[model samples]
Target: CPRFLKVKNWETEVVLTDTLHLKSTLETGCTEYICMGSIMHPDVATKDQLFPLAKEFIDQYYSSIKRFGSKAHMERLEEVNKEIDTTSTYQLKDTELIYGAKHAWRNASRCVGRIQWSKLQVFDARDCTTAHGMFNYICNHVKYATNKGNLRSAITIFPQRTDGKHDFRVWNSQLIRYAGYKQPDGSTLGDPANVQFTEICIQQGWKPPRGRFDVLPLLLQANGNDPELFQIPPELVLEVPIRHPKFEWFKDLGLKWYGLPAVSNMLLEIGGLEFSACPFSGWYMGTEIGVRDYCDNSRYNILEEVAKKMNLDMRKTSSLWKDQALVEINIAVLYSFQSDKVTIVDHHSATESFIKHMENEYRCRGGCPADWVWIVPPMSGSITPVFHQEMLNYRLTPSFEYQPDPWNTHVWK
Candidate 1:
């Protein structure tokens, strides 16, 4: 088996294996950074520094609604701005939170399906003080987003930051992630992404299951509290068992994936307010799991196994064994999701929809910025329409952003 290393940036301390530390050059002519799960760290800014950006977002929003610079709105905003540092708790009305959450979705440039930005269902859970309350809200969010195969885009926002108090946080990177158990031989049992988190759960008294593909429990935390691990109910977590349409042996592999990928660790920034515990979800594009997760060696590393099953010539570089097996894996993923009636989009269809979204944005908004590497699917790179298109990537406010791990920061006790 060919060893593969997933690199994040030119300079960062990333351990691939027990003894392997990634340097700048992993392979010859490979200058581009590896697509890590968390692409960027959330910016740290005080209210004095961030209020202007918030004002710009608010001003645009108010102008769109024909209430730009309204006395009542401006007065309320001005009062908040004045109390930016001294205020203990920042409060936003239900209407404001709803509008901000929708705008945050619209400002997410990496998402291909921004056309449905207007239809997002927002759930407010600011009153939840205990970790169990947060867990209940997350369970409800998952149920609603799943919707029995007809997935709906939704977000649940917890309380924002408050002075002299700890912030509420969902410790898990995602609501649904497979456990990664470290073997005595230094090999991981499941998804490598969750190895560190799995250890954290064990330290926190979580008794993990004895299977490689077991769904990990949810880790919830509030300010100055020990993170609590809550096991997801078997029925609420809808999983699709994988099986190929023609390949009989594929079912024996016991491959499966969760219905929704609700990201919880990222911070939601709306009008200068950061909701650190807001979790959101949209349907998956097949390649995210098929190519990046299963195919990548640093992850599940299942390509060689599938290739051997198909009897490919692995010795020759020109045989294109990896590429052929990759396509088959992606096909299996799409087929499995469709069989289970779960919503998923193929690369071609997703790219086409993205192009349509760009065109729509160009007419409504001045321009649409996007990262091409993220826009392009991992498989069939050059064949897609987005591969040929050029996008001017830029920063936008009222967006969901990656943040430093709360555990790392020692913010969540």
Candidate 2:
């Protein structure tokens, strides 16, 4: 149960959510403003304001490709302003969009696997004008990234905002999320976190299924506005069944997770244009599936069952049954993914990569941004180097951002 919250900064309102998550299921720390937050620009109202931000990002792109101060860079840079002055906005070349998407991932300070940021496959779906057309491209993104369990980092950028009036958006938080239903017995059948979204599908006229791991449908909004529901073909989504190395009965639990994490809700901010609909996907880290979603009581609350199976003393906190169950669940996650030939990273290796990646960033930019709260995993503290390290967090542009939910933003009449 985490939600997004914006904090007022000296620059403007910067988005920072998952307050409990940035902390935990339930806890609060002193408001630390130093932590790296996102940089936000108000919706582009005119070409004049949009022109400057576009130039800044264009300069960033040309330099990134080592064409800085070159004739080619200047013309494209000048060409953008020219187009904007006449039409109030300009289009991005396919190559520019490709690099911009990758750079946004590079600027995603929260990512532990940022070492692979440059490897993202950017799918340009700018041609899509209808919800059904959006569905086809989304299917391609899922299938391509799924890659038969060997997941790959990819993003499908739909049309950019053309004045925020007819902005294209994916109403679903993620392309692959499970449905949550409120049971009459005062319990949740699937993920309690996704109950609201499941209701949206039902209200929009789709058959609701009563299954815990039932993959949700795509709620896509094109220029038409009212988001249409499109079920992802079952054959395309790749999920791995959780299994334990020693506990043979674990397979009977029917617990599973989707192979890819295509986060569909965030606004892809590059230059002055905000890509209202962009679903970027990457592989999962260890604790995401095992610790938070699986073991956390507020969510799945699966640990008691795990501990019960092992005949552990659950009544006493000192018995360490929760810890024992947690370790097993974490083990099962890694075992299942690796055994299923899926791309996943262990916490130890991932944290270790950050140290190396941080060094790489420092050498490239003199300093690197990190949110120590999220950068360090929940399971290990001093055992991991990230816990001991000091970091500076700051906002960076051309980054992914949290946005308001589609329904609340407008009544969609």
Candidate 3:
């Protein structure tokens, strides 16, 4: 009937604003909506809750491999049950982890890029024992996903959250994000969204470069310790200097962005086990950087600046200054990424490809849960087919759930 985001020392009844919360809750047997759910030893999920959730995944895995009802399938199920009885948790095979990673991507309702869901590379880093080890694993992931510009979708999974104390975590929301600094004159500089995170980095001994597009260092926690700040290897990070194909002066504006968008903190739930530190990544869709990251008022907020450069009338919304600016920005994103030999998709192609993914899912699974807000491009809403398309919303086993931020939650050393 109420919501509480359970943390180590304390938790209060809370309201979730992020869209993923509802779908994740729907799986709690009407409960991540209903925890009456947990992994709580120092967890809440007992064998009763976990066994049921885990069984579905085993069955799904077996079914996918045409092994359902076979002796091997039942034996696998038996092992999982026995393992849970012994340790209150179960182990997933490397193949199982790989499949689960892909499964969640396919079911990520808000993502319009599921067309490549089946093609992800899962890097198993479950043996990681220290924050230092975590850094190496992440650097490897960045290098692999960057692919020298031919970007690839990938997920690097670390140890699961067996108990609260030894939980592994990647502090940055994405593997790559720019630093934000609070200026002296009551204004913000750099990426405003990251000012708080930047403060944490500084407190952890990070020296700020104090420049726009300065990639923040990674703050990692492993084996229940204080976070360690590690600068991402610059050579591994691919970036594009934004330039319009026709506007030579656009480059003078000095805007640049990281090429890959690797989400580093979402929890990966396969069966009943939670890979709390799994960092997954994929190439950017045009509007992701161009429209929201660069143009949102809370972000770079460069629409007015760009419009002024283009000599567009910024008198009002009807003046279409923002609209004109959006097109050029979007074009610049696609053009810049292409010029650098990095992989990127335009809004038109991305949404259109999603329609094809939807068709494939429906034919095979009867219906697919699709989040309309996410499917439709922010830069070109009504112009996309997904804008008018009616789609249902639901979640299934093998999903991704949001995890608590490391700094926000108290931890053991």
What local distance difference test score does each model get? Answer: 0.78, 0.82, 0.83
Clashing pairs in 3: 25-32, 25-33, 31-34, 38-45, 40-43, 40-44
Please identify model 2 stretches exceeding 4 Å from their true place.
Answer: 1-43
Leading candidate by lDDT: 3
User: How would you encode candidate 2's per-residue C-alpha lDDT over 309-362 as one tens digit per residue?
Assistant: 888999999999999999899999999999999999988898878877776776
Q: Alpha carbon lDDT of residue 25, candidate 2? A: 14
What does candidate 2 score in Cα RMSD to the true structure? 7.8
Each prediction's RMSD over C-alphas, in Å, is 9.9, 7.8, 8.5
37-133, model 3: which lDDT tens digit per residue? 1221116368888998888888989999999999999999999999999999888899999999899888887789998999999999999999899
Error of 3 at 309 (Å): 0.8
Q: After superposition, how far is residue 308 of candidate 2 from its true place, in Å?
A: 0.7
